[PDB]
Symmetry: D2
Subunit: 410 residues, 4 copies
Amino acid sequence: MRIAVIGGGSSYTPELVKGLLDISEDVRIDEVIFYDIDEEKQKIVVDFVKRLVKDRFKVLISDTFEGAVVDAKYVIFQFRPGGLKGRENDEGIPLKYGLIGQETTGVGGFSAALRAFPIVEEYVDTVRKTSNATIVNFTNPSGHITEFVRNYLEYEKFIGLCNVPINFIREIAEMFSARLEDVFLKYYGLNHLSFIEKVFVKGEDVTEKVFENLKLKDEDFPTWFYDSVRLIVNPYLRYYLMEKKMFKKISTHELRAREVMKIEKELFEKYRTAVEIPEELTKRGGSMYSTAAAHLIRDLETDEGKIHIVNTRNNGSIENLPDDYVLEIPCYVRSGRVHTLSQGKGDHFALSFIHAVKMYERLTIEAYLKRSKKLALKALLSHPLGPDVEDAKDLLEEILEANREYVKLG
Amino acid sequence: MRIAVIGGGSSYTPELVKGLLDISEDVRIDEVIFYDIDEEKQKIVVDFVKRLVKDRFKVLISDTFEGAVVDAKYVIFQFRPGGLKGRENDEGIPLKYGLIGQETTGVGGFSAALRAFPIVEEYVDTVRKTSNATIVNFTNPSGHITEFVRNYLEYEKFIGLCNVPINFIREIAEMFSARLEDVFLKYYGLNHLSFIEKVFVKGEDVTEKVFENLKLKEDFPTWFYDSVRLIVNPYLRYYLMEKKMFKKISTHELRAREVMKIEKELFEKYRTAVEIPEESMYSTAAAHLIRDLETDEGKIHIVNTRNNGSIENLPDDYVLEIPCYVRSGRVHTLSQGKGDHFALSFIHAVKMYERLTIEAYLKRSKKLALKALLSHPLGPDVEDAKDLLEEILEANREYVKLG
Amino acid sequence: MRIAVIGGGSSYTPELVKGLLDISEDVRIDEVIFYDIDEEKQKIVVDFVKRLVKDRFKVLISDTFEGAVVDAKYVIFQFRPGGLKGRENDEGIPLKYGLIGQETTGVGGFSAALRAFPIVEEYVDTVRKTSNATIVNFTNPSGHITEFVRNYLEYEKFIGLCNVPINFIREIAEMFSARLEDVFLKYYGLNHLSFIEKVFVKGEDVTEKVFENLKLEDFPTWFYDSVRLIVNPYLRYYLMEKKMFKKISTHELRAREVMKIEKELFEKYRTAVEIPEMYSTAAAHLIRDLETDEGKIHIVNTRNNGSIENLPDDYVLEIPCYVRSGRVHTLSQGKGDHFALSFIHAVKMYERLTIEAYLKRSKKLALKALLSHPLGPDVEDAKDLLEEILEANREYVKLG
Amino acid sequence: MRIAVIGGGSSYTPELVKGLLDISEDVRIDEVIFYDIDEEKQKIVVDFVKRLVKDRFKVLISDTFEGAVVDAKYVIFQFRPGGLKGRENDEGIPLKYGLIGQETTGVGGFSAALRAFPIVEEYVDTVRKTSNATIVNFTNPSGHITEFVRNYLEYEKFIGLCNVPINFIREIAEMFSARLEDVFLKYYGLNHLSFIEKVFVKGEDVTEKVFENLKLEDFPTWFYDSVRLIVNPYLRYYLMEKKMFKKISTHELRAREVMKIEKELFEKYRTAVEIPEELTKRGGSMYSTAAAHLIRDLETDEGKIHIVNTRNNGSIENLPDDYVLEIPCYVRSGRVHTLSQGKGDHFALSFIHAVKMYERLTIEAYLKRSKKLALKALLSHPLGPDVEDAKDLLEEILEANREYVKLG
């Protein structure tokens, strides 16, 4: 039983490995093998990992992608195509057009996806021709990449993960002094575009209590919003519903990527000597993506049967929506399989966003598969946060020049 | 055989009647009865109508709505709830928030729908308890109202009409020196939110020739047609060219104010006329539809109705604007295949907005109205929603009350 | 926390109660209240129950249906409309026409259903107007009744149960030395009309091993090689009609046998200190898991809702569900086999035609329903058959 | 503009040609080209054809299938795989098992289908790599073949035809003194498994009057009062199986009667100046008008209704989009559009679903060349064998069809 970690140099690696250590008591893990296109970055991180692991499983490095995944049962995608400079372009370029610049939402997520697709195509292909492992994905944009792998590359064992579902659950658990698994949600939407309609803790409906609580805590939704919409809304929906406010915010402060560059450079210096995971990591980004990955793999391994909110085909989870939409929804996870659960109908409000962005998602895939500039423009125009006709051509040209090393559109 | 016309004082009435006279040779019409809440406006128009009709059928006025529809086989809704003052509010109010102000699109159509729903509920109810007539609808927003009647009031014989499909068809017809019926389209979308994917003239695929000719006409650039590959309803300019349209609307006289002046001019002309003044084609659509509902010939009309498999990509119950086979009182939808992903993003988004709006009205809920307003692609940001709805509801005090 | 048991006089009651005793350690049960139209039958059984219970919860009798369900969280339907004399007619009458006579399959199930509908309509209405309890149903035909309540009476909390899914799991469990929950199935169909496509034990795919072990009046080897489905034994009546008809028609009717068995058990229950020599476990385990927040899999009858993507969402099917805190969620299974679907579709249409006939109280529509069943009459026999069914069921159903 | 006719030697050919001559005034036809595996049979028929046509268009014979379809805009499948001896096997073999033996219904249609698929696969493939013509199909079992081509070979321009829709329409037309196009139906089901729910003549709903008229070997009055559908007469095999079995099994096999009808028609063809009365009155001789009218209306931009075998696409909302059904379509300029009809009756659906599953099971058996899957398909048919008879029945069918189909 071996796990491959693709993008070993991620500054999140230590947390991932803590997670794998935590579960290595209920499931057998023989070796974890790491791969990164930045040999030197990974050396520092994996050296730190070795100190944390203390021979509880074997820590290995592979020179090639194929070498890492060849004998793997689980493959974790955790790499960032184009790196932080790519993120910086994603956040920075749309700004001049009066458009939201953000890592995974809107035009920023469009360029991130175009950067990712070629790499994931290559990677998924190699996995498929060798180990046929289950791929657990964090690489952003996670949901959009899942849609691409599930519905176009047609690789079934590809599960998109994100940090927000688990962050929400832990929040509720603390509020109600309960374990993570005591929390059961009606949850649906796309990655970073999701909605909670019902909250259950130890079987009790506590939705009303959660709403009343959310009102006692300018950049967040007003009370009337929750009264009217009656959904708990993913924080990323601020970019859609509070665009003017979010634009003024992003455009008048340092770009986020530049701040994470400084955080990562500080964490790396810490990693050269650190004997225990530093604080600096723990309270940032999505530090708890680690727990999600490790818990998912745990439950894929045992025959216990547990609920995980995961990115996968609808398959009747929301009867309101096509079976083949990849959604972020709670699933029954057991012995290598992921089963969707009945949830009933989705709210019209939520569906307006879900449908809009899903069409944009597939338009973008179509453009990439045909390598078409014309279809990319069509995709760009279809996003709710995309350019007006007067800006689209110039915007796309800026994107493609910035990403010339990663994607070529004719 | 009797036709009722609800909103007889519409400045469009003379054209409708011209249309009714043109078809009265292929189909029997005994009487046309008119109803309006403005008796004096209607007297002027109907006096003019009588001079055009010249006893070819009976022209009657009813003092009540029920009196008009009671023995009617067809009922035409052509009234404007809240009148032009209402339209002016619709266009004017959203402007202060940096939002598109327009008669049928965005926030403006939201308030127009809230004004319409109570009236059409009452009217549809009365028709249902009396004549069970086919209602042909022009009242805006036509598609949204159709969604409401077909899927919530559950009255099957309600057909939404609009002037764009016929305007396009005639355009193509004269480009190609062919009759109206020689033009066959792949056409789908919502009312004022519609797309043309394929154009056929006398059986020939002329799509490419249509695109090339569109390039030789505040309109879409050449590359847009190359990339999207759909002929797009001009109202999509409000979505796709919002900045440009906002700049235009907000630096010119509101359109409703212009219409007020045109209509005042037409009404002075109507007191004196013996023939229709040069100073609109919705008429032909209504009369031709009624003609074809009457005969057993079987003819294609683009109307607003339930999808039912016209676009396989879309739920059966979405009310769409689509080509149907019309024959002996019945409207059948036609196979068209799949709709484009780009088209569907608009269709899904505002269809959700449409139903959220209806739900808010049915429960008479301010909270639900905010929800609906937030859901429109051209709606307010959260910071402006509450103020904008309070302004809409004050302005529309007399027409709708939300709790 | 109170459970109501409708049809307390059922000879099965003892086992049900043993079941509720077993789970009364993981979940709190204050009282079990019984009701039966046969007061004397029930008194003997419930006196037996009191001896087994030994005051671990309160055992009560209600004079009225309303009195039983008024304060109940769970209501178990386990009555037999028309009794065994009704089942005797069900089994006996179709035989005359060369038709399969069977308690729940074919024309037999049709009359059983028409007998049930009026009663379940009344009972569901009273539950809905009082406690709004979850109804767990054994009353035959279980699945058809569930289709009726879920899609026509529109009462959501009505869960059809059957003893075949649990019988199968138990068999697999002991074949592989595993606990019941170690077994996971791809399972779908209608009640008494179900198929297993895949078998998992402790996560391992053992479908192949199950097929090989099944080959060691039942289907031949080649059948399993061809169809590649483990098939409910009731499918024998569709697939081996000639053989089944020959069997049913040359032996004592089954209901007659059961009458003798029940008369025997009843004399035993008068003095019996212990249960004399499996639906019970299903009911209790389901109630257990509805009560806790653990989350467990049960095969039950419910709306498809995407369990089988190949089938309409509203078909009531017998399928595995995730059960937890008063809620039943269906699980993804993928596509159903064309072979299975041909039976599922045909009898589902039959089921709704029958319900439509009942709701309109129409003889004409009943004929239509009768003709539509794969095991139903030919046109030449339909009218006589129906008139014989309605005659025998005079006291239970009137069709106009 | 060229029409290819595959199976030129069919004794129906003269009628088909009459049909093409009737429409050759509203649409242009330059040449009709014929192909048959029996050159001798065809020569006699086409010689007769030439005397009817009178140089109105050119009548040509092709030695090869490819040669016929290469330049065609329309290709008519009109052949009978295995011929009349094949039909005879289909009708005869099931009989010994107490099963309905019929040309297109039940076990008989199963073996007919397995005989057909290899040939239509080859033919569709060749059409697809050359002319891309619209194929109009009569070859039985028509609906099942259409399911196969539409959903498995994935050739879109393949339209299944049958003679019952037009026979019904014509009946109604005469009853009401109206033209064929004055008759509009709510019509759906499978080929030879179809139901009429509503009847309109000149826009009037005359369903009630049609039911009243139908009551003046056939369904009794109460049946129509109960089921309230006008049912295709082949449904007698399902609904009156005992009666139909007793009938078929105690009379000369139907195939043997048509052998003698055909032999008589061929003798007539040698010197006939005009179409004989025995051809007008037999088989499903009105299939001709259906073919010709369909092609006419695919050619013009008029827009006309034709009941045809095609994908559901929302015609019956109660049924999946991809079921091939026999349903009314809007036909115009090369395209076939499906019409809204609403919901299908539960009674009708039970037949439609059951046989549709059997149809796809049979196709899957053929495509995998699997004896095992064939047994599965056989067992799924409402009119199929019991488990005790299945194995023996299939081995008899495969033996008889050795030259047409091989299943491992």
